Design an enzyme around this catalytic site. Structure first.
Site, PDB file in Angstrom:
ATOM      1  CG  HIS A 172      -0.257   0.202   2.436  1.00 60.44           C
ATOM      2  ND1 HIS A 172      -0.243  -0.156   3.412  1.00 60.44           N
ATOM      3  CD2 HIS A 172      -0.195   2.061   2.343  1.00 60.44           C
ATOM      4  CE1 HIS A 172      -0.454   0.338   4.749  1.00 60.44           C
ATOM      5  NE2 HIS A 172      -0.220   1.519   4.311  1.00 60.44           N
ATOM      6  CD  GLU A 218      17.141  10.147   7.867  1.00 64.65           C
ATOM      7  OE1 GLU A 218      17.647  10.278   8.294  1.00 64.65           O
ATOM      8  OE2 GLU A 218      16.786  10.437   6.714  1.00 64.65           O
ATOM      9  CG  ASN A 242      16.813  14.189  13.087  1.00 65.98           C
ATOM     10  OD1 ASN A 242      15.997  14.674  12.311  1.00 65.98           O
ATOM     11  ND2 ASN A 242      17.078  14.975  14.976  1.00 65.98           N
ATOM     12  CD  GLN A 284      19.113  18.346  14.732  1.00 64.86           C
ATOM     13  OE1 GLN A 284      18.104  18.308  15.351  1.00 64.86           O
ATOM     14  NE2 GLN A 284      19.348  17.349  14.814  1.00 64.86           N
ATOM     15  CD  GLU A 305      22.053  10.990   7.498  1.00 59.08           C
ATOM     16  OE1 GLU A 305      23.527  10.831   7.354  1.00 59.08           O
ATOM     17  OE2 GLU A 305      21.215  11.922   8.689  1.00 59.08           O
ATOM     18  CG  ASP A 363      -0.071  -3.998   2.687  1.00 56.29           C
ATOM     19  OD1 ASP A 363       0.054  -3.008   1.924  1.00 56.29           O
ATOM     20  OD2 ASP A 363      -0.787  -3.326   3.958  1.00 56.29           O
ATOM     21  N   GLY A 375       2.506   6.392   8.597  1.00 57.00           N
ATOM     22  CA  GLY A 375       3.887   6.655   8.392  1.00 57.00           C
ATOM     23  C   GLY A 375       5.004   5.793   8.723  1.00 57.00           C
ATOM     24  CB  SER A 400       2.033   2.355   6.610  1.00 56.01           C
ATOM     25  OG  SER A 400       1.239   2.279   6.850  1.00 56.01           O
ATOM     26  N   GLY A 401       4.667  -0.460   6.282  1.00 54.73           N
ATOM     27  CA  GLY A 401       5.506  -0.939   5.804  1.00 54.73           C
ATOM     28  C   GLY A 401       6.710  -0.905   6.341  1.00 54.73           C
TER      29      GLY A 401
HETATM   30 AR   LIG Z   1      -0.317   1.869   9.565  1.00 57.09          AR
HETATM   31 NA    NA Z   2      19.091  11.781   9.439  1.00 61.82          NA
END
Ligand SMILES: [Ar]
Ligand code: NA
Length: 240
Positions: free
Chosen positions: A45, A59, A61, A64, A69, A93, A186, A188-189
């Site tokens: 989704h 990752e 933050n 920042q 990263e 899903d 946010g 999700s996944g």
């Molecule tokens: Ar969710």
């Molecule tokens: Na960052």
């Protein structure tokens, strides 16, 4: 994640941020789990929109410079073939993303370990959800990676009428539902991490929460059950 705490920087090195191009900048939309140096597991989704996607590994933050990263384009998207965007309750899903580069592994960037195929956790098995999702229903994304302690709710309970009823399938994992702590938009996944025989494995791909709210008592967060899809995942990666 509602009712979470900030993760320490090196706790969940398989967690990624899946981002889309908005304007000429990038916005977090979903989590994911790094499962090969050039493959990420996420929710189907999350990649329904015809968008440009990138992955960020290492990752912590979103807003920042962490100094850890790596930013990598998504080159190919393989959505589960039985996924239906207007029917999340049907399951499936799950999607795999082939990255344009192979990321470098370090203490901030590691492959997520998946459970053995068919593994079902006992009721109340201890797990953490992680992500940058909303910190309150109808709130805002977290800046820093959050974790929340979410014990599993087994199928028998989760599929009971006071919980999720017919909505949940044996192909899913339920966790939490205490009304305080949950996944949220946010997240999700992203992973559900559960500690078995001393080691964490990624048992869930965050799929959905209640339409009434993220942290709703007796509406645990619902996850795609990773151990249902081991053959599928390996098949995709071996043909791609
Ligand atoms: Ar969710
Ligand atoms: Na960052």
């Amino acid at each position: 994640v509602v009712g979470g705490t900030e993760a320490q920087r090196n706790s969940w090195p398989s967690q990624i941020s899946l981002q889309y191009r908005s304007g000429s900048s990038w916005a977090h939309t979903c989590g994911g789990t790094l499962i090969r140096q050039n493959w990420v597991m996420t929710a189907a989704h999350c990649v329904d929109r015809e968008l440009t996607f990138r992955v960020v590994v290492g990752e912590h933050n979103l807003n920042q410079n962490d100094g850890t990263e790596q930013y990598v384009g998504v080159q190919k998207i393989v959505v589960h073939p039985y996924w239906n965007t207007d029917d999340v309750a049907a399951g499936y899903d799950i999607a795999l993303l082939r990255l344009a580069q192979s990321v470098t592994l370090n203490s901030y960037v590691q492959l997520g370990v998946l459970p053995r195929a068919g593994t079902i956790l006992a009721n109340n098995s201890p797990c953490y959800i992680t992500g940058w999702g909303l910190t309150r229903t109808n709130g805002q994304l977290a800046q820093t990676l959050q974790q929340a302690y979410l014990p599993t709710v087994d199928y028998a309970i989760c599929s009971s009428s006071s919980y999720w009823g017919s909505t949940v399938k044996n192909s899913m994992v339920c966790a939490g539902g205490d009304g305080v702590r949950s996944g949220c938009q946010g997240d999700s996944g992203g992973p559900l991490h559960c500690l078995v025989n001393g080691q964490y494995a990624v048992h869930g791909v965050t799929s959905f929460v209640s339409r009434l709210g993220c942290n709703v008592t007796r509406k645990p967060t619902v996850f795609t059950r990773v151990s249902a899809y081991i053959s599928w995942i390996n098949n995709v990666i071996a043909s791609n």
